[PDB]
């Protein structure tokens, strides 16, 4: 499917919820919203890093230790 | 002021909070459809005063609530 580039807000968040490696929700007025991130899609790559199969905490660590600009590929 | 919401199939009404204040609303949720507002403090849930309670207690009240959740905000 597709590749979405987002920018962390002033709280360090791009604006989505996930569980089991899949995006379940998008936050109103967020970079995920503005950039067209879609729910019910599995996350494949974050900043060039394959996250298929990683635990949610490992994904969350990648996202939290990423810089301001976060690019995610989804399927 | 007082907003009535219904939990979805995952048991959520559609908002994020921290330090007793609503910080985000989730797209296509009960909170969005019913006009829950960000950057407002949570005062009551299901008629119980929650001003001053810690976040884990507020979260506990929300999770233990039945399907209909009414929140008063200010």
């Amino acid at each position: 499917p597709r590749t979405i580039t987002m920018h962390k807000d002033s709280t360090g968040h791009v604006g989505f919820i996930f569980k089991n490696g899949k995006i379940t929700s998008i936050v109103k007025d967020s970079s995920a919203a503005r950039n067209g991130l879609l729910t019910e899609h599995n996350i494949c790559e974050i900043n060039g890093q394959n996250v298929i199969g990683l635990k949610d905490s490992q994904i969350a660590d990648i996202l939290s230790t990423s810089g301001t600009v976060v690019t995610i590929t989804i399927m | 002021r007082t907003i009535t919401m219904h939990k979805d199939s995952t048991g959520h009404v559609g908002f994020i909070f921290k330090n007793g204040k609503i910080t985000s609303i989730v797209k296509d949720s009960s909170a969005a459809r019913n006009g829950l507002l960000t950057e407002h403090n949570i005062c009551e849930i299901n008629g119980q005063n929650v001003i001053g309670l810690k976040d884990s207690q507020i979260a506990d009240i929300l999770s233990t609530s039945g399907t209909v959740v009414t929140i008063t905000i200010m």
């Binding site: 919820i17 | 994020i16 909070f17 884990s56």
Partner: peptide, 6 residues
Amino acid sequence: TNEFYA
């Protein structure tokens, strides 16, 4: 961090 989803 330390945010809650409800």
